[PDB]
Paper text:
Unlike Cas9 and Cas12, Cas13 is an RNA-guided RNA endonuclease containing two HEPN (higher eukaryotes and prokaryotes nucleotide-binding) nuclease domains. Cas13bt3 (also known as Cas13X.1) was recently identified as a minimal Cas13 protein (775 residues) and used for RNA knockdown in mammalian cells. The crystal structure revealed that Cas13bt3 adopts a bilobed architecture consisting of the REC and NUC lobes, with the crRNA DR anchored in the REC lobe. The NUC lobe comprises the HEPN1 and HEPN2 domains, while the REC lobe consists of the Helical-1, Lid, and Helical-2 domains.
To clarify the crRNA-guided target RNA recognition and cleavage mechanisms of Cas13bt3, we determined the cryo-EM structure of dCas13bt3 in complex with a crRNA (61 nucleotides) and its complementary target RNA (25 nucleotides), at an overall resolution of 3.4 Å. The density was less clear for the NUC lobe as compared with the REC lobe, suggesting that the NUC lobe is relatively flexible in the ternary complex. Thus, we modeled the HEPN1/HEPN2 dimer structure in the binary complex into the density map as a single rigid body, except for a flexible loop in the HEPN2 domain (residues 703–729, referred to as an active site loop [ASL]), which was not resolved in the density map. The crRNA spacer (G20–U1) base pairs with the target RNA (A1–C20), while the terminal five base pairs (G21-C21–G25-C25) are disordered. The crRNA-target RNA duplex is bound to the groove formed by the Helical-1, Lid, HEPN1, and HEPN2 domains. Upon target RNA binding, the HEPN1 domain moves away from the REC lobe, with IDL1 serving as a pivot point. In contrast, in the ternary complex, the short a helix is melted and residues 582–608 form a continuous a helix. These structural rearrangements of the HEPN1 and HEPN2 domains result in the formation of a binding groove for the crRNA-target RNA duplex. A structural comparison between the binary and ternary complexes revealed that, whereas the ASL is ordered and covers the HEPN1 active site in the binary complex, it is disordered and the HEPN1 active site is accessible in the ternary complex. In the Cas13bt3-crRNA-target RNA ternary complex, the HEPN domains move away from the REC lobe, and thus, the ASL becomes more flexible and dissociates from the HEPN active site, thereby allowing the access of ssRNA substrates to the catalytic residues.
Numbering used by the authors: 14 to 221, 238 to 269, 288 to 625, 635 to 702, 730 to 775
The structure:
RNA sequence: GCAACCAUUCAAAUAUGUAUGCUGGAGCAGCCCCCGAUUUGUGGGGUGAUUACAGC
RNA sequence: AUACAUAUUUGAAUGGUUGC
């Protein structure tokens, strides 16, 4: 239990962790401070007070020296216990206590209740097992620390306590992934695109893998366009809905509202910002994939100049330029005005149509849809409109089937003279949401079917009181320009008779990928119904956007194709590299390719008879797991050797060093000699090595 | 042929926090209808607005 | 009830280990 109780061969789990800390300190000497500050870069709120931050900044040499001392202590049979003492004074102790209390707070505040206590890092001026685990965490990948904690925890009886304690102790540990300089998001996007493409389009699923539920084209397109074009940045959303262009938070969601995004293009003399729809986005992706991205972005950048030129000469400009201008501009210059009579007719027809459809659909409509309709009726009949609180309260009643409380609400509005007795009364004969909804539809349609009076024009929103100056509207418009639908199409494919889908198909066939979707083509067309009927248009468009997404995936894989000197065979359901076959999805969030020598030796030494393609699962079970098992035995053996004693020597040192550092830099013959010397000195183990 | 343990992915259920209204402007954008059409069209209409909008 | 985030439980698919 206490750290003092780990003597001789029992030290092994700590030997492995601390040697890895040194392995990693030799790759990067800055890891203590890097790890301590990792999370605080993402926090407005200080993780540390000012003096703590100061101590952290000075601590590299101290922490690196302590790392070496403990590695020495844990790698020897007998070492002086002095290194296990941290005084109250100790810089490292203060740092550790602050970092730990911070981690606990971070854990607890995300839980619904406080269930457990956390282990102390210190007892008097002596580090505990938990303290030693915490110290090493700063230097090692999550998998190393989990392996250590798994060996030394007294807490595994209670799964919940074990995992929460582990969460705190492992707060500051490195990501498993060697390649990740926190820009390996292309790996995750690759997997996400493949996962989405493998889901069957909803409409095809219902007719004939999981079902696709969400269209993620825009999300993928934004990640791809930002990766390809450093001049471009899309609006991110936060709720205080605020749109900003900060790339400080990677997790932060893109602003996507009704298939619109906000783009900022930084060219020439400074950034220009536009709203861009799905239509323009998908053409931009298509153009980017074919190497015309820079040119497309140049044309979008210049778009505002054209608008500004047209704005001065609306009356005289070519009618073709009217497309770039909102109604209010054209109407100001006497273009496309409609008689109030015509505006009334269109408005009333629409609102009538909306309410006839609601009336027909009551039984099929959601409680939210029905509640909104009922509230829209009450609100429009109120002297003073609902405040947010009043609205919320009544909505909660309707959604919760609390018709009694809703009717008590109407009574209160009546007693307050906000609604008249008629409005209260029309609901008195109803007991259900559906009945109330029908009554409301009837009252509204009665109002809309009247011979056109002054009250009607106001009711349907044609009655303006407040006058905004045209010149204010123009100014607003100029800072809120949206790209005309079909803009990029007209700039690049003016005289093209090929639709979007055919342009995508032509690029796919001739572009050099030689890929297509891995879903059966039947999932993109219902053979039994006409080309243009039902879901067939939407599925055909989906085939084109999926093909774009496949090409985006092919671009992303390209980045990790650039990294290292290993070939890729990429299938729908596997990646093969020189061979190891990663299954499930792509890898199943795996790595291992970063140490090619080690993977080579793992395969050579633990799987000598296997040739050609080997499953990752097999490499793990027969290789990495087998290595880990052997490593425990060799470290335990080496420590027991030291205890007892306190070409053969060469081999012993090399094999020892290999197992201490988690590599295979020795030959089979050399393990023979190591094994011989262990046998000669009393310490046997069931080596299970070398392999048949 | 079956069970247990570990790892990975998907679906479903439960709890907690936050949001949901009004007025004016905005329909270049998004969406829908009609008209064509191996399908998403710088073809015609709409859309009491869904809002990088201003206030209460 | 809808949207978003966090946490917990169950089932299904895949591989390995153990027992008969």
């Amino acid at each position: 239990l206490s750290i003092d109780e780990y003597q001789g061969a029992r030290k092994w789990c700590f030997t492995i962790a601390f040697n890895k800390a040194l392995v990693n300190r030799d790759k990067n000497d800055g890891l203590f401070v890097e790890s301590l500050l990792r999370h605080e870069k993402y926090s407005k709120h200080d993780w540390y007070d000012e003096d703590t931050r100061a101590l952290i900044k000075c601590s590299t040499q101290a922490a690196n020296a302590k790392a070496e001392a403990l590695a020495n202590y844990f790698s020897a049979y007998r070492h002086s216990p002095g290194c296990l003492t941290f005084t109250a004074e100790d810089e490292l102790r203060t740092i550790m206590e602050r970092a730990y209390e911070r981690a606990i707070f971070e854990c607890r505040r995300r839980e619904t209740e406080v269930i457990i206590e956390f282990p102390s890092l210190f007892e008097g001026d002596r580090i505990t097992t938990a303290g030693v685990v915490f110290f090493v965490s700063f230097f090692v990948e999550r998998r190393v620390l989990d392996r250590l904690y798994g060996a030394v925890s007294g807490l595994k009886k209670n799964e919940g306590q074990y995992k929460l304690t582990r969460k705190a102790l492992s707060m500051y540990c490195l990501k498993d992934s060697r390649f990740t300089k926190a820009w390996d998001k292309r790996v995750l996007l690759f997997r996400d695109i493949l996962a989405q493409l493998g889901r069957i389009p909803a409409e095809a699923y219902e007719y004939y893998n999981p079902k696709r539920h969400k269209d993620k084209f825009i999300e993928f397109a934004l990640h791809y366009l930002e990766a390809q074009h450093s001049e471009i940045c899309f609006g991110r959303r936060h709720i205080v809905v605020v749109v900003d262009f900060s790339k400080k938070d990677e997790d932060q969601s893109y602003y996507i509202s009704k298939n619109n995004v906000i783009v900022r293009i930084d060219k020439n003399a400074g950034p220009r910002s536009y709203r861009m729809g799905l239509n323009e986005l998908k053409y931009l992706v298509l153009l980017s994939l074919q190497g015309k991205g820079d040119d497309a972005i140049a044309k979008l950048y210049r778009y505002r100049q054209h608008v500004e030129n047209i704005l001065d000469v609306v009356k005289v400009t070519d009618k073709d330029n009217h497309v770039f201008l909102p109604r209010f501009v054209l109407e100001q210059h006497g273009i496309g005005r409609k008689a109030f009579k015509q505006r009334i007719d269109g408005r009333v027809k629409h609102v009538r149509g909306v309410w006839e459809k609601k009336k027909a659909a009551t039984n099929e409509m959601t409680l939210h849809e029905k509640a909104r309709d009922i509230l829209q009726y009450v609100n429009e009949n109120c002297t003073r409109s609902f405040n947010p609180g009043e609205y919320n309260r009544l909505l909660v009643c309707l959604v919760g089937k609390d018709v009694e409380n809703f009717q008590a609400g109407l009574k209160r509005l009546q007693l307050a003279e906000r609604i008249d007795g008629r409005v209260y009364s029309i609901f008195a004969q109803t007991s259900t949401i559906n009945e109330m909804h029908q009554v409301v539809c009837d009252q509204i349609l009665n109002r809309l079917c009247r011979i056109g009076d002054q009250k009607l024009y106001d009711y349907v929103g044609l009655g303006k009181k407040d006058e905004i100056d045209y010149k204010q509207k123009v100014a607003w418009f100029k800072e809120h320009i949206s790209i005309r639908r079909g803009f990029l199409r007209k700039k690049f494919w003016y005289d093209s008779k090929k639709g979007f889908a055919k342009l995508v198909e032509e690029h796919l066939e001739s572009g050099g990928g030689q890929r297509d979707v891995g879903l059966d083509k039947k999932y993109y067309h219902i053979d039994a119904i006409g080309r243009f009927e039902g879901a067939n248009p939407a599925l055909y468009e989906t085939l084109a956007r999926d093909r774009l997404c496949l090409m985006m995936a092919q671009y992303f894989l390209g980045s990790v194709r650039k990294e290292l000197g290993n070939k890729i065979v990429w299938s729908n359901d596997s990646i093969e590299l020189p061979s190891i076959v990663f299954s499930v999805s792509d890898y199943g969030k795996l790595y291992v390719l970063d140490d090619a020598e080690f993977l080579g030796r793992i395969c050579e030494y633990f799987m000598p008879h296997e040739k050609g393609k080997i499953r990752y699962h097999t490499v793990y079970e027969k290789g990495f797991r087998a290595y880990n098992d052997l490593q425990k035995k060799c470290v335990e053996a080496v420590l027991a050797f030291e205890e007892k004693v306190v070409a053969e020597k060469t081999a012993v040192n090399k094999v020892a060093r290999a197992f201490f550092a988690h590599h295979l830099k020795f030959v089979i013959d050399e393990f023979g000699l190591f094994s011989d010397v262990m046998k000669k000195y009393g310490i046997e183990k069931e080596w299970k090595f070398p392999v048949k």
